[PDB]
């Protein structure tokens, strides 16, 4: 249930939003999700995970609070 | 409606806000941005149509404010920012209603942004702006009677080649408690 719900979640999100989320989770869980994204997002997210030059400390745990939201186990 | 002298004072109340908006987002777009303000008088329907569907619409008020004002941001600019603050280049802006995350991030931004407006108004009326409600559809808002005249603030945001609009809506119910005028 932790897998399926995260996917429904990121399918809607921005290619840059989806990117950052998969970079904080370990690559296993992340790519397990990256395998449930469509054709375009699989590539569009992936090439943007390449260009994660620097991330913002406030925006991440603001996503961690948009996490803790609607999936049971974190 | 308004006077010939009231339109002039209102140009110097979106003064600083023109320049403060300028150096604020440029500080968060990590590049130079120029901003220009054009002011006008419109009916409340002349404005509610000139907002594309959908769009990012924030309605707000103040402590000393009896009423409600609109903070409008076109969607092309909206997603352009969301990208930059999440390690992006400035993508192609998808024209869709935003998700939970994407507003929660930007509400904090339109909050810090709206405060800048209030820092130009501290000369005439001090107020802490708190956002009442958020909406994405302009045919769903309609705060005051559809034909009540409005102070419309058009902020021309532009950089590089791209260009967009920030709009703030002051409807005649207004500072009519403060139209026993400041000056």
Swiss-Prot record, chain A:
| One GO process term, biological-process aspect | bacterial-type flagellum-dependent cell motility
| Keyword set includes Ribosomal protein | no
Instruction: List GO terms (cellular component aspect).
Output: bacterial-type flagellum basal body; plasma membrane
Molecular function via GO = cytoskeletal motor activity; protein heterodimerization activity; protein homodimerization activity
Question: Which segment of this protein is annotated as the motif Part of the EHPQR-motif?
Answer: 13-16
Q: How does it assemble?
A: Homodimer in the absence of FliF. Interacts (via N-terminus) with FliF (via C-terminus) forming a heterodimer. Interacts (via central domain or via central domain and C-terminus) with FliM (via central domain).
UniProt name for this protein: Flagellar motor switch protein FliG
Gene this chain is encoded by: fliG
**Shown residues within the full chain:** 117 to 187 of 335
UniProtKB/Swiss-Prot annotation, chain B:
Keyword tags: Bacterial flagellum, Cell inner membrane, Cell membrane, Chemotaxis, Flagellar rotation, Membrane
Q: What is its main location?
A: membrane
Q: How does it sit in the membrane?
A: Peripheral membrane protein
Identify a single GO molecular function assigned to this protein: cytoskeletal motor activity
- Is Cell inner membrane one of the keywords? yes
The consequence of residue 15 to C is:
No appreciable effect on the binding affinity for CheY
Q: Specify the superkingdom.
A: Bacteria
Return the GO cellular component terms, semicolon-separated.
Answer: bacterial-type flagellum basal body; plasma membrane
GO BP terms: namely: bacterial-type flagellum-dependent swarming motility; positive chemotaxis
Where found in the cell? Answer: Cell inner membrane; Bacterial flagellum basal body
Residue ranges that the Swiss-Prot or TrEMBL entry lists as coiled coil:
none
This chain's function reads: FliM is one of three proteins (FliG, FliN, FliM) that forms the rotor-mounted switch complex (C ring), located at the base of the basal body. This complex interacts with the CheY and CheX chemotaxis proteins, in addition to contacting components of the motor that determine the direction of flagellar rotation.
Q: Which family does it belong to?
A: Belongs to the FliM family.
Subunit structure, per the record?
Answer: Interacts (via N-terminus) with unphosphorylated CheY. Interacts (via central domain) with FliG (via central domain or via central domain and C-terminus).
> This chain belongs to which protein, by name?
Flagellar motor switch protein FliM
Taxonomic lineage from the root:
Bacteria, Thermotogati, Thermotogota, Thermotogae, Thermotogales
Q: What gene does this protein come from?
A: fliM
